[PDB]
Design a protein around this ligand. Structure first.
Ligand code: ADP
Ligand code: ADP
Ligand code: MG
Ligand code: MG
Lengths: 69, 370, 69, 185
């Protein structure tokens, strides 16, 4: 069981990292803008918050995986 | 119903039913005719004996072979053999069941047509099919990618297949087989004093070949060992209570397979033909054919043929490639074991050539799928 | 009578083994296929069941032959 | 919902979902047809292999490329590729999600129309969009002022943009790409 759950944790960590990369790319694109469309102004904040949430989730997952080890 | 699977060969006839593991009957394909007067009264006058009874009474008969080098030379004798197989041997009327026959690749067209006509007009089977000998071997082996090396009596051929797509340009055919080895055995046994001339004496030499022969891993070293010492000697007993003592000739008979220059021929040994066939295919499939070689036929039962074949191919072929020679036991019947399997398959039960189809289309029908 | 029936049991066992060999060979061929024809898909199941039936019949026959012994 | 982002290329097909960092599936855009007779019984016959299995069994197939120099030459084979991508590879029904395609600049008009029709009448996607290959590069790069130099297989093109105002008279197109290099090799 231990090995299977460790593998599942690894898969979840990989998925979280894959999400972080795309969100960081989108925020990197949106930052350069100078007079963004009103919708983009809200979308930038939404992505900024989602990045933080994903980073804490990644931290928690890695901590749990290390704890099992 | 059960469909007969006969395998008219060059040196033996094997006939049986589908869904079995061995031929129902197996007997030599010879026809013997009496040679002498006949003096007693009340004994049945037989024009010609056929099958095994002729082999039993070979003393006073002139045995003849209807088939030679795969091709059929005498047709009356072949029809007699077929009649004997269907009625006396199998003991089943041919009208009820279909039949499946086997013919070697690259044979003359006329053969197929004449076979069909003799199997429809005279015997009146409800359906007949004919298949290439090499292909049926792969059903028995159990794979789909390979290079079969069927080596029967009379002729030997190579047919590479990949993913069930037979390559027709790589097929190779050669006329070196057991009969030439028997003749060479007679010719070289002449040296020690033993002289075999008549046909029955040839039959005796064939038994000598079958029992006492093997293939040396290396030839020059084996000859040196046989000359220096006297350990490679065997004693055999004739029907006349006489003892033959064979020495070197134990491994000079099969050796002609790898060195066809002994008989005056010019083609290359069987390993070179196999290698050339492999290298005549595409680049991307050579590895798979290298990995899976297959042997069939009676002639490939010599003790030690697989090892020498593997060694020679490995020496010829590049490194970094792994060569295996799939050489299962009971390879003798391998071809036949294919046909029965091919008969069993549900799909194949749609591919026969019904009698009315031949009546309408004509003789060309069989060649459409050739 | 005992000897005759024992011989008949031996013959039946031989025939059963001869059938098993052919059925196993056919199944061994059919397994390697990767995209079988629709008919072959059903024939494979039929042969798989026939093999089991023959094996149980062989077990019963050998048990009876031993019991006579 | 998630919107598929397929990039039908000239030498490879990359298909995936939005909000990812890499294509879900990537495979060559070739169609192989069998060349030889076929002697075994039961194997079940196939008219033409498509995608990666064709690359696996290249020994006995005649591989053909439906696309060349960006333009689409053979359509019945380009539709087979799209069907394989949507059903076998991605394993998602195309009806639910929209789709985004990419087409090189200065290509014939008819191409766009035919692509649209094949993506509406046959596959029935609820919405489709098509974009120029060069422009999408600048989102990935992260800037707005630049001169992209996209060089795929088949063709190579240059599209200069400044403050998000693509200059259309400066665009350049040329038919030198990987296929010609393979032939020269
Ligand atoms: N055990 C054996 N060892 C060596 N040679 C054999 C053996 N059995 C058969 N042969 C040779 O093979 C020949 C028979 O080949 P066969 O299997 O009948 O081929 P086909 O089925 O094509 O006629 C015989 O002439 C004999 O010389
Ligand atoms: N690592 C590499 N080194 C050199 N050439 C490459 C490499 N990877 C791909 N290529 C070349 O690029 C071509 C594929 O281009 P691709 O990225 O598919 O462009 P497109 O998506 O427009 O088809 C191939 O034909 C190959 O020759
Ligand atoms: Mg044979
Ligand atoms: Mg590209």
């Amino acid at each position: 069981d231990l090995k299977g759950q460790l593998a599942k944790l690894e898969l979840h960590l990989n998925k979280t990292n894959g999400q972080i990369t795309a969100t960081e790319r989108t925020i990197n694109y949106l930052n350069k803008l100078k007079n963004p469309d009103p919708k983009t102004k809200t979308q930038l904040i939404e992505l900024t918050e989602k990045l933080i949430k994903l980073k804490q989730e990644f931290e928690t997952t890695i901590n749990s995986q290390h704890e099992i080890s | 119903t059960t469909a007969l699977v006969c395998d008219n060969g060059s040196g033996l006839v094997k006939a049986g039913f589908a869904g079995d593991d061995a031929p129902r009957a197996v007997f030599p394909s010879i026809v013997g005719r009496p040679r002498h007067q006949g003096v007693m009264v009340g004994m049945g006058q037989k024009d010609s004996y056929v099958g095994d009874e002729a082999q039993s009474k070979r003393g006073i008969l002139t045995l003849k072979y209807p088939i030679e080098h795969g091709i059929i030379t005498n047709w009356d004798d072949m029809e007699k053999i077929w009649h004997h197989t269907f009625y006396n041997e199998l003991r089943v009327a041919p009208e009820e069941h279909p039949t499946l026959l086997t013919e070697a690749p690259l044979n003359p067209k006329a053969n197929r047509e004449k076979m069909t006509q003799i199997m429809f007009e005279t015997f009146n089977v409800p359906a007949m099919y004919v298949a290439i000998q090499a292909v049926l071997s792969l059903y028995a082996s159990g794979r789909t990618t390979g290079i079969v090396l069927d080596s029967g009596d009379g002729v030997t051929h190579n047919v590479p297949i990949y993913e069930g797509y037979a390559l027709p340009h790589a097929i190779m055919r050669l006329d070196l087989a057991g009969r030439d080895l028997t003749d060479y055995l007679m010719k070289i046994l002449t040296e020690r004093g033993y002289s075999f001339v008549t046909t029955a004496e040839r039959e005796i030499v064939r038994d000598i070949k079958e029992k006492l022969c093997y293939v040396a891993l290396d030839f020059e070293n084996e000859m040196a060992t046989a000359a220096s010492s006297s350990s490679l000697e065997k004693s055999y007993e004739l029907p006349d209570g006489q003892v033959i003592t064979i020495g070197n000739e134990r491994f000079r008979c099969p050796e002609t397979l790898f060195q066809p220059s002994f008989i005056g021929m010019e083609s290359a040994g069987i390993h070179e033909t196999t290698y050339n066939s492999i290298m005549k295919c595409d680049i991307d499939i050579r590895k798979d054919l290298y990995a899976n070689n297959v042997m069939s036929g009676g002639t490939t039962m010599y003790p030690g043929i697989a090892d020498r074949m593997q060694k020679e191919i490995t020496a010829l072929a590049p490194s970094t490639m792994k060569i295996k020679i799939i050489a299962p036991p009971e390879r003798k019947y391998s071809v036949w074991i294919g046909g029965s399997i091919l008969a069993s398959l549900s799909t194949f039960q749609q591919m026969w050539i019904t009698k009315q189809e031949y009546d309408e289309a004509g003789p060309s029908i069989v060649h459409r799928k050739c």
